Structures are given as C-alpha cells and as structure tokens.
Write a protein that binds this ligand. Structure first.
Ligand SMILES: Cc1cc2nc3c(=O)[nH]c(=O)nc-3n(C[C@H](O)[C@H](O)[C@H](O)COP(=O)(O)OP(=O)(O)OC[C@H]3O[C@@H](n4cnc5c(N)ncnc54)[C@H](O)[C@@H]3O)c2cc1C
Ligand SMILES: NC(=O)c1ccc[n+]([C@@H]2O[C@H](COP(=O)([O-])OP(=O)(O)OC[C@H]3O[C@@H](n4cnc5c(N)ncnc54)[C@H](OP(=O)(O)O)[C@@H]3O)[C@@H](O)[C@H]2O)c1
Length: 388
C-alpha cells in the first residue's frame, strides 16, 4: 500500500513463456491482489521484494562467521540467515564507503592497506577495473580479504546495502483483470568478466515461484505499484505506435488488453501498430496466441515482426521500422503517440537513431531540425520510453 512499504501479495499463476525448444526462459506470473488495497493502471510498474539464493546466503555466512541463530533488530527481531536472504544486497559491488568499513575491521595490515587503497583517490582506476568492471560482488571482495571481519551491526549498516526491489512493467489491464497483477520476466543468467556465475536475484525467484494454481503452499512476495507516465492517449481515435521486443512487450500487453476492454463498451479503435522482435518464431515468440487474437479483433491494427536469428536475415524492430518509414510518418502527421519499451543501451538507442533518420527522408528536414523535431515529440508527451 506504499512504494516504500509493500503488501503481502501471493503468486496465483506462474508459467514458462518460451517453448521447450527455447534456450532461454521467460516467466509469466500473476499476482493476486484480491482483498488488497492495491490498485493499478495500464502501463504502471509493480515493484517486487525478493530474496537471495540459499547458496549465496551460505557463502555470506561462511565469510561473516556469525551464528545464523542470532536474532537482532535491523535498523520485530530477525535472524542473521533471514536478514542476509531478504535485506542484504550481497551480489552487487561494494561502494567505496563499504570498503572503508571493511578495512576498519581488517586485521591483516596488507589486506587493510589494499582495502583503504581501493577506496582512496589514488585507487580509483584500480577500483574501476577490479571491482566495477569485473562486477565483483561483496562476497568476492570479502573472500579476497578474509581478515576483514566486520561486526553484525556494521555489516548491515555500512557494508551491505539493502536488497532493492525489482520493478516490472505491468502486463495486464485492470479492466481485463482487476484482481491480478501480470508480470513478464526474463530469467537473468550471466557470467561476470571475472567469471562468476550470476543468477538474477528476482528473476530466478519468479522463475521458480510456486503459484496458488498448483498448490496451497504457494509463493508470495511483498509487492507495490508505482505510477508511470507510460499511459495510453485520452481517446481511442488517436493512433499509437508500440515498439518493444523481448520483454519490451510487457506494457503493450496491458495496452492491448485496455484497448479491447474499452472496445467492448466503447468506440472504434484508432490504428494500432506494434513492432515486435524476438529470436525465433519457434522459441521466444512469447504471447503469440494472444497477439493474433488481438488482431482478429480490433485491438491492434497491425503486427510487424522482426526475427533476428531465424532465417538468413538478422531482423530488428528498427530494421522493420525503416521499411515502414512511410506509413509511420503518416501516423505522426495524424497525431500518433509513439511508445518504446525494452533494453535501454542498445535497442532504444538504435530505435532512437532510426527515428531521427526516418523524419529526414520522409520529412525533408536536416539533422538539427529533425533532432529538434523529435525532441518536441517528447516534450509534447507523444514520444515515450520505458527502458532499462
Ligand atoms: C521500469 C522497469 C521495468 C522493467 N520491466 C521489466 C520487465 O517487464 N521484464 C523484465 O524481465 N525485466 C524488467 N525490468 C528489469 C528488472 O527489473 C530487473 O532488472 C531484471 O529482471 C533483473 O533482475 P534480477 O534481480 O533478477 O537481476 P540482478 O540480480 O539484479 O542482476 C542484474 C544485472 O546485474 C549484473 N551483475 C551481477 N553482478 C554484478 C556486479 N557485481 N556489478 C554489476 N552488475 C552485476 C547481472 O549480470 C545482471 O545482468 C524492468 C526494470 C525497470 C527499471
Ligand atoms: N547483449 C546485451 O547487452 C543484451 C541486450 C538485450 C538484453 N539483454 C539481457 O537479456 C535478458 C533478456 O532481455 P530481453 O529478453 O529483453 O532481450 P532479448 O530477448 O535478448 O532480445 C529480444 C530481441 O531483441 C534483439 N536485439 C538485440 N539487440 C538489439 C538492438 N540493438 N536493437 C534491436 N533489437 C535488438 C535480440 O536480437 P539478438 O539477441 O539476436 O541480438 C532479440 O531478437 C535481459 O536480462 C537483458 O539484461 C542483454
């Protein structure tokens, strides 16, 4: 019932979205909010509190040397083991103030000197490479310096920051489902430059959550809702363009549920065009069936697709945007809103760059005018991005 403070909501359904032939995974999850004061609007975000994997917690317990059977008041009582699971960010990289604190408690002079060094101005380049670039966890830094043994209070006050909640762009509309909060969540699983195997904290928890639809002893999590400006226009007559691939599809599923929801009790839809992208029609084409239904009805006018690993061609959403550069510019002159959701470092940037180019050819403006023009779709509120 608060952004800072969560509501114990349960997991009703949890399903894999990829096919058994997919090499990756994407979970569809539904939070049951019946009887909770939680309310949400299309395009809003849901924050989720999660916990650490037990192996990671155990490595911390090894390193810290506490009795897990100690109870204590995190600034009502809790055990060391549960505090590490739910309140300690163990896997991100220690800030410099956290290294300072470890050094204070490092009984090896050389280890204590190295910790203090990495936190000093003199050590900034080294910190950037050995800690940040390599994505070394608090648990690794601590193993590198085993004489650093901070007391329980310091550890939670200065060494480990709290385990932040993870945000997901809600993928359902309240009209279609006012009792369920829908999330679409890619399983994260990387290897750091230093070679640590990292399981995404919240995306692994979601992947393995037990839903009430398969057992009574079901999973639950403290959730909460964050209002966003990623909202549909006032009236359906306004034409809209939705661009996100992969999990960038999430908000638009709510968008299409909302169009349809209004559509049953309302006016004709404006043209809807959705650019989707994924690896293979037979692997990660999440929500395929639902999308064709949205087409059979009037929810979405059209669904361009981009498959980047299936077939000879590496097709991306922006590549499918340039081919359709004529129709979308017409959409702009008709007053269309444009939505971009998904990966922020590559796709959004690439899509942003493509957008600037399309106006030049289909608008006859120079680079500066195009830039100012696009900047002005943003200010007007017609160009929206939900990226991460
Ligand atoms: C507004 C918003 C909406 C979102 N919507 C969605 C959505 O709809 N679907 C979805 O799947 N996700 C979404 N995300 C992203 C999501 O919130 C999480 O970031 C993502 O799921 C990973 O969560 P995780 O806890 O599992 O991974 P984490 O455990 O947080 O890991 C995150 C990344 O950090 C890397 N990492 C590991 N160790 C280190 C280190 N020491 N230093 C630096 N980096 C390290 C990992 O390799 C990994 O790539 C959204 C994010 C935002 C902000
Ligand atoms: N390499 C990266 O830096 C990168 C990019 C995106 C996501 N991720 C990670 O992978 C996980 C799943 O994310 P997701 O499901 O949204 O991503 P995804 O499934 O990897 O991406 C879906 C589609 O987006 C395509 N794509 C990749 N780069 C693109 C670009 N620059 N422009 C346009 N399209 C592009 C992918 O192509 P290909 O995959 O065939 O290249 C794929 O076809 C996330 O946890 C995320 O952190 C990593």
């Amino acid at each position: 019932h608060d952004a800072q403070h969560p509501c114990q909501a349960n997991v009703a359904v949890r399903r894999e979205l990829h096919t058994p032939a997919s090499d990756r995974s994407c979970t569809h999850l539904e939070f049951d909010i019946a009887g909770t004061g939680l309310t949400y609007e299309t395009g809003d975000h849901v924050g989720v509190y999660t916990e650490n994997c037990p192996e990671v917690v155990e490595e911390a317990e090894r390193l810290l040397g506490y009795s897990p059977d100690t109870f204590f008041t995190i600034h009502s009582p809790i055990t060391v083991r549960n505090a590490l699971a739910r309140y300690a960010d163990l896997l991100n990289s220690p800030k410099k103030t956290s290294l300072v604190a470890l050094a204070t408690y490092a009984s090896d002079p050389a280890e204590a000197d190295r910790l203090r060094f990495l936190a000093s101005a003199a050590g900034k380049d080294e910190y950037a490479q050995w800690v940040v670039a390599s994505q070394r966890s608090l648990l690794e830094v601590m193993a590198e310096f085993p004489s650093a043994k901070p007391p329980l209070g310091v550890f939670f006050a200065a060494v480990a920051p709290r385990l932040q909640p993870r945000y997901y762009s809600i993928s359902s509309s309240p009209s279609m489902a006012a009792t369920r909060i829908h999330v679409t969540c890619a399983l994260v699983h990387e290897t750091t430059p230093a070679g640590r195997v990292h399981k995404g904290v919240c995306s692994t928890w979601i992947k393995n959550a037990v839903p009430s639809e398969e057992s009574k002893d079901c999973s639950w999590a403290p959730i909460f809702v964050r209002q966003s400006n990623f909202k549909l226009p006032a009236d359906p007559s306004v034409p809209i363009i939705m661009i996100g691939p992969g999990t960038g599809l999430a908000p638009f599923r709510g968008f299409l549920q909302e169009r349809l929801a209004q559509k049953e009790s309302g006016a004709e839809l404006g043209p809807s065009v959705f650019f989707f992208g994924c690896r293979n029609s037979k692997m990660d084409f999440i929500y395929e069936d639902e999308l064709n239904n949205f087409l059979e009805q009037g929810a979405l006018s059209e669904l361009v697709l981009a498959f980047s690993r299936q077939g000879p061609t590496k097709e991306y959403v922006q590549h499918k945007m340039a081919q359709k550069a004529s129709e979308i510019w017409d959409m702009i002159s008709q007053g269309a809103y444009i939505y971009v959701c998904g990966d922020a470092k590559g796709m959004a940037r690439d899509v942003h760059r493509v957008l600037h180019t399309i106006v030049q050819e289909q608008g006859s403006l120079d680079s500066s005018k195009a830039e100012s023009f696009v900047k002005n779709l943003q200010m007007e509120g017609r160009y929206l991005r939900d990226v991460w």
